Write a protein that binds this ligand. Structure first.
Ligand SMILES: */C(=C/C(=O)OCC)[C@H](C[C@@H]1CCNC1=O)NC(=O)[C@@H](CC(=O)[C@@H](N)C(C)C)Cc1ccc(F)cc1
Length: 181
């Protein structure tokens, strides 16, 4: 096995989970300890369904920038025994671009799905069905419903969470390491 494939599969096995909220199916990224991240629009309630079981959410922090503008991420703290393998060191200190990224999706409807979205570029501002949103990046791939939460990855780096699309292009909320400090 090559190393790119080994890293994505390991991500699926240890960190990228199938979840459902009352808003539908999403891909969740577990980052470290009991800390995971979802797209804010998933609106996790007091419990969330993770793979095969209902898991209690102890805390949910919706991330905004300094202008109070939406970043489209929610940090959730889970009531579980598991500590996620810590992948914080694979998350850049600042929102970074990449070449030939792969989007890793894991949902009940789209299990263990690899989507070659190509180069990921700085985009910045995105208007999400009436909600202004900062710190996004963009890939010219026609992503679809059911793919939100998907993890944007390239050469052993975890750089974003899939949040939206327009039929031609897709957009992620950029990851930075300090969110998970
Ligand atoms: C992922 C979430 C989803 O499936 O919604 C139903 C649960 C999608 C992915 C989009 C859909 C089409 N292509 C994609 O990659 N995210 C959304 O649908 C997102 C809104 C958009 O993408 C808009 N372009 C819209 C016109 C389809 C959801 C969203 C709504 C409101 C917000 F404040 C933030 C996000």
């Amino acid at each position: 096995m090559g190393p790119s494939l080994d890293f994505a599969l390991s991500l699926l096995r240890r960190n990228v989970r199938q979840v459902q909220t009352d808003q539908g199916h999403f891909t969740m990224l577990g980052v470290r300890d009991r800390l995971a991240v979802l797209p804010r629009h998933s609106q996790p309630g007091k419990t969330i369904w993770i793979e095969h079981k209902l898991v209690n959410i102890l805390d949910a922090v919706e991330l905004v920038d300094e202008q109070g503008v939406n970043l489209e991420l929610t940090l959730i703290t889970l009531d579980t025994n598991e500590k996620f393998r810590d992948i914080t060191k694979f998350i850049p200190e600042n929102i970074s671009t990449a070449s030939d990224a792969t989007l890793v999706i894991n949902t009940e409807h789209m299990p263990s799905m690899f989507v070659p979205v190509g180069d990921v570029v700085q985009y910045g501002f995105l208007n999400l069905s009436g909600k202004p949103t900062h710190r996004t990046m963009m890939y010219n791939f026609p992503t679809k419903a059911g793919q939100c939460g998907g993890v944007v990855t390239s050469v052993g780096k975890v750089i974003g969470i899939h949040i939206g699309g327009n039929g031609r292009q897709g957009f992620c909320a950029g990851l930075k390491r300090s969110y998970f400090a």
